[PDB]
Homo-oligomer: A and B are copies of this chain.
Amino acid sequence: DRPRFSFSIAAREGKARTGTIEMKRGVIRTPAFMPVGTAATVKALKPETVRATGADIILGNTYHLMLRPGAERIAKLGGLHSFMGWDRPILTDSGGYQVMSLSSLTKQSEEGVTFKSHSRHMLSPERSIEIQHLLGSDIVMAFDECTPYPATPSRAASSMERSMRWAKRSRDAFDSRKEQAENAALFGIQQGSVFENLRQQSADALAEIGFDGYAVGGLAVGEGQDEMFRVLDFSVPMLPDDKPHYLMGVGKPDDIVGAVERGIDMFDCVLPTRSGRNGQAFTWDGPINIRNARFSEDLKPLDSECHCAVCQKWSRAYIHHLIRAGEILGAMLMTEHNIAFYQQLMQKIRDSISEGRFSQFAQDFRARYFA
A residues sitting closer than 8 Å to B (CB atoms) are: 39-41, 43-46, 68-69, 73, 76-78, 83-85, 296-297, 299, 313-315, 317-318, 321-322, 324-325, 327-329, 331-332
Contacts and interface: CB of A to CB of B under 8 A. Distances in A.
A332 B84 CA distance: 14
Contacts of A83: 315, 317-318, 321
Q: State the oligomeric state as a number of copies.
A: 2
Contact of A44 (B43, B73, B297, B328): B328
Nearest to A44: B328
A48 to B, nearest CB: 9
A328 B43 contact: yes
Contact of A68 (B313, B315, B321): B321
B41 A327 contact: yes
20 contacts: A39-B321, A39-B327, A40-B318, A40-B322, A41-B322, A41-B327, A41-B328, A43-B327, A44-B328, A44-B329, A44-B332, A46-B332, A68-B321, A68-B324, A69-B296, A69-B317, A77-B299, A78-B299, A83-B315, A332-B332
Contacts of A43: 327-329
A208 to B, nearest CB: 41
A77 B329 contact: no
Contacts of A78: 299
A295 to B, nearest CB: 11
Contacts of A332: 44, 46, 328, 332
A53 B171 CA distance: 49
A314 B69 CA distance: 15
Nearest to A45: B329
A328 B328 contact: yes
Nearest to A298: B77
Nearest to A77: B317
